[PDB]
Amino acid sequence: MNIFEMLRIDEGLRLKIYKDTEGYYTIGIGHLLTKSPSINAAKSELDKAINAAKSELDKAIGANTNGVITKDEAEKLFNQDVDAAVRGILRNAKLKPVYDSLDAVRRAALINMVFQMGETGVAGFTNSLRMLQQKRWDEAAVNLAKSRWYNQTPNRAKRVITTFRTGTWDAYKNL
Ligand SMILES: [Cl-]
Structure with a gap:
């Protein structure tokens, strides 16, 4: 057991954007994208927000993903995110x-x-x-x-x- 295995158990692995309990659009192994609007929000607002999450993901991956990534791409974001958490602690x-x-x-x-x-x-x-x-x-x-x-x-x-x-x-x- 190590930090990668531990976080993989806690975060799961999803290959399409989803909304977490705090209302953040997420993908991969706990990769946070952007905030979602209210469940009432506005049909207009919701589309806007989804597209903002897709734009964040495209920027992170460097490709037009339309909200879907591969397992290798999820593991790349995960490697970056574990590195960032450690660097955040150390600074x-x-x-x-x-x-x-x-x-x-x-x-x-x-x-x-x-x-x-x-x-x-x-x-x-x-x-x-x-x-x-x-x-x-x-x-x-x-x-x-x-x-x-x-x-x-x-x-x-x-x-x-x-x-x-x-x-x-x-x-x-x-x-
Ligand atoms: Cl104690």
Whole structure:
């Protein structure tokens, strides 16, 4: 088990644009494109938004995709996105010291959070980050669950939290 395998389990693999729980058009292995409008929005607005997502995807791939990509292209965006999450942690003054304090398995759990919510978002979990840096694993686990993150994607947040709690890959075994 490694960060790629871990995120592939959490993000899945879809070859056509879809909308995630936070209302973002997404594709591949968790590659975020752009925001979608309201479900009422406007027939006009919806088309506009879909085309904006397709335009984002075309720019990312460098080809006219019309919203569909191959598995190889999804894995390329995934390689870029994992690299970006790590670079985001290393350039961030709040995240880098926590990352440096962690063992390899827990480092993967932090990269997973950053991949899902971005650098700025995770850097704002000040209390949980302090607990992690102090190796207060159970406290960190309890604190991390008191979040919109956990309430919105509980099964995935539980796996990530169990990873911080135990420093093992148990939550991803048999998945
Ligand atoms: Cl603890």
